[PDB]
Symmetry: C2
């Protein structure tokens, strides 16, 4: 009845979010909706504020990209109002969602690194409030144990910006035992790694391979170009709206396929 949807975004400065929002705006407008965004950064104080649009009767449905951490409380506020969780969701909950299989993806990256002769794979992680951070860290650890590797180092980036990945990398290079590959949970973090490696005069991938995650345009801009896990980000957004519309017209955790895109930073 209002012709408006609310989108809670985790980080508008994350280019993954921007590509997912583009897909959401496309499907919403194809279906006669317009979209309002809240840059929540999974801060329930901002969420509580923007959700007054439900009770204010200003929107017909909600899509969230907020951290798993926040989802139980969001459920208390949102209740049965149309809702889809997008990229970030709770697989134990009854709320409809769409994402990829993060665990499968990070396991495949580690397997490819191992198959290529790398043994000392470090992870650059971000905020464990997010289930996708949790999953990618489990997939990583899963395959280190499997292949029987004994190096394991995870560096937690504070911000999702290149400088965070860069300093994470210098941090990893400080040890006696240095990685021979760095898997970053985002392409922005990985571009920062590539820059630290380069200023350190390490060849990529001959000294240290780098693999990122998401397949956003930065992965094509970096030298060397960045091997990454490409999400179908735009379609994630489109499918979130399609699932939402189904609740709006009434009265599943959907997984879309990812692709490993092999580039020079790993080959």
């Amino acid at each position: 009845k209002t012709g408006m949807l609310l989108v809670m975004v985790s980080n508008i400065a994350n280019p993954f979010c921007a590509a997912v929002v583009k897909g959401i705006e496309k499907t919403a407008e194809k279906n006669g909706y317009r979209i309002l965004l809240c840059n929540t950064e999974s801060d329930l104080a901002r969420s509580r504020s923007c959700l007054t649009l439900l009770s204010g009767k200003m929107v017909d449905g909600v899509i969230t990209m907020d951290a798993l951490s926040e989802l139980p409380e969001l459920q208390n506020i949102i209740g049965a109002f149309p809702w889809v969780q997008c990229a970030e969701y709770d697989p134990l909950s009854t709320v409809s969602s769409v994402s990829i299989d993060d665990v499968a993806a990070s396991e495949y990256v580690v397997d490819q690194l191992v198959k290529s002769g790398k043994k000392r794979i470090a992870l650059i992680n971000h905020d464990l409030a997010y289930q996708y951070a949790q999953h990618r860290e489990s997939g990583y650890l899963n395959r280190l144990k499997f292949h029987g590797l004994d190096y394991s180092r995870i560096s937690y980036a504070e911000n999702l910006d290149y400088m965070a990945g860069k300093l994470a990398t210098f941090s990893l290079l400080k040890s006696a035992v240095k990685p021979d590959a760095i898997f970053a949970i985002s392409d922005v973090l990985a571009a920062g790694a590539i820059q630290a490696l380069t200023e350190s005069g390490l060849s990529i991938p001959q000294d240290v391979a780098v693999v990122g995650f998401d397949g956003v345009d930065i992965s094509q801009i970096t030298v060397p170009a960045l091997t990454t896990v490409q999400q179908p980000s735009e379609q994630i957004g489109m499918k979130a709206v399609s699932l939402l519309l189904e609740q709006i017209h009434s009265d599943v955790h959907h997984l879309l396929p990812w692709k490993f895109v092999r580039r020079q930073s790993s080959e």
Copy 2:
């Protein structure tokens, strides 16, 4: 008790917007406000729609980063509601604004390229509905004529992304006379110019210099690092809120003001 403010964003995928939003949020949230965004992209139907929040009393004021020419189309909806324009500059407009001086920055860009010996400077422009894109184009064309340069050329990126930059660049290289320098209206487009230039085997700056605009992180990621016009992007958003708060505040009758914040030409390897 906590209010909300509406931001009408010109392109949520433009890292300059994200930087202005960041400053908006910092100032707003110290003053008891949270922020709602609309990715309006100077689409009038989108703008009209998100502006029902003002009428509906869900937000206390609007900061717009849309094309300047949208202002008169919305004046009837906004009336006396608190209203501030970012990144467009018209001192005859009655809507208070905060931005840089685009004409002075772009002429300065051209003067620096000409000082360094460049004589065929091209422009990658994007969406001319924005007055800043018009001013950067005039500033570029007038300053070439001012230096008596014979070469002029402009190629228009359809989207704001690196591929659009790269395509604009291939188009400028496909010509009788090639540029010896490329000035882009955003660092995003310039990163694509650097990519096409490199894949074409041109040396930067030796064969073709590149200059961008805005001073966003991509400009520190490209190889060579990207000479650019650095905007104080966060300060633009914080100031926009400050101006919006004078309007909201009961004890001041706010007047029109058009703040110009300083830009800086930041020299990197892509031009030096």
